[PDB]
Amino acid sequence: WNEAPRALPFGSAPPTLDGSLVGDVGFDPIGFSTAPFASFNNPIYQEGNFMTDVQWLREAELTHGRIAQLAVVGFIWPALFGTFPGNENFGGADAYSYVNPLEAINHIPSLAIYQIVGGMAWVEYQRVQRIKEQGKDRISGDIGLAYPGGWNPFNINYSPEEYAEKQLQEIKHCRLAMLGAFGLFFQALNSGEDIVSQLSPAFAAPEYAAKAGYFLPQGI
């Protein structure tokens, strides 16, 4: 085990880390990288075709981070940018008027829930197919979004160094958004309010403390 890596300078890291994957600083005090985490009971497994446990963990981390990145904006946007102009002739009975994110879950018709579930299941199936076909050679991520070779409606082109820095930015924002989504959800649950109604009051004053006003006559 290597000693004194970047982050945890007074600890140690397993040798499986190495370099390779972007964003590797050496943070691994427990383990989880020295075990068969992608081969034991994998139903899709394929000897001489799968990747390395660390790449499987990177895929899981990327999935969680992408979901959290979407969730942070999902929490923030309706509070201060207003609700969707919907509920017009929809018969929702102010179903969109709620802003408390944990309250709108019990007022949205099941159509949207099942549409979202099905769409993400389709995307996951595409990811599974790509993972199965790219064998022990997965550029990781896959799902063929806007990079040349797959779908690219805007025709995004980048130099390899641009791709590397974009990957680093993506992973950093993913970790930060995981933390932020956790914090936002638990703050909303604990305070029973959204973020805007929780931060707005602590900006000017409480009413019981501010002075009455200015009542001195002028001109005397």
Partner 1 sequence: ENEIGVLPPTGFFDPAGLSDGISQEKFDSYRLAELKHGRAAMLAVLGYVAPETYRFGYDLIPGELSTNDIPNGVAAIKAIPFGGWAQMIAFVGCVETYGWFTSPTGVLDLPDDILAKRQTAELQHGRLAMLAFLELIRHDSQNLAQPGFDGLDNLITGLPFLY
Partner 2 sequence: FENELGAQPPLGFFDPLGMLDEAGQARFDRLRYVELKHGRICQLAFLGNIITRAGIHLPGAISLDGTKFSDIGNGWAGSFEVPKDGALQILFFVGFLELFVMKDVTGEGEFVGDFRNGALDFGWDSFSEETKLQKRAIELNNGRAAMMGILGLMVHEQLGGELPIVGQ
Site of interaction with partner 2 (CB under 8 A): 43-44, 110-111, 114, 125, 128-129, 132
Name which of 106 and 110 has its Cβ closer to partner 2: 110
Nearer to partner 2, 7 or 113 (CB): 113
- The three-state secondary structure class of 25 is coil
| Min CB(63)–ligand A86 separation in Å | 18
Residue 100 exposure: Cα atoms within 13 Å on the Cβ side:
12
What is the Cβ-side half-sphere exposure of residue 5, based on CA atoms within 13 angstroms?
17
Q: How far apart are CA 53 and CA 16, in angstroms?
A: 10
| 26 is an annotated ligand-binding site residue | yes
Q: Is 175 a known ligand-binding residue? A: yes
Residue whose C-alpha is closest to residue 123's, from 83, 63, 184: 63
For partner 1, the binding residue among 36, 109, 118, 144 (CB under 8 A) is 36
Q: Round to whole Å and give the CA distance between 167 and 158.
A: 12
Return binding residues for chlorophyll a: 6, 25-27, 33, 61, 64, 124, 127, 145, 170, 175, 187, 190, 198
Q: Which residues bind ligand CLA (CB under 6 A)?
A: 67, 70, 111, 113-123, 179-180, 182-183, 186-187, 190-191, 198
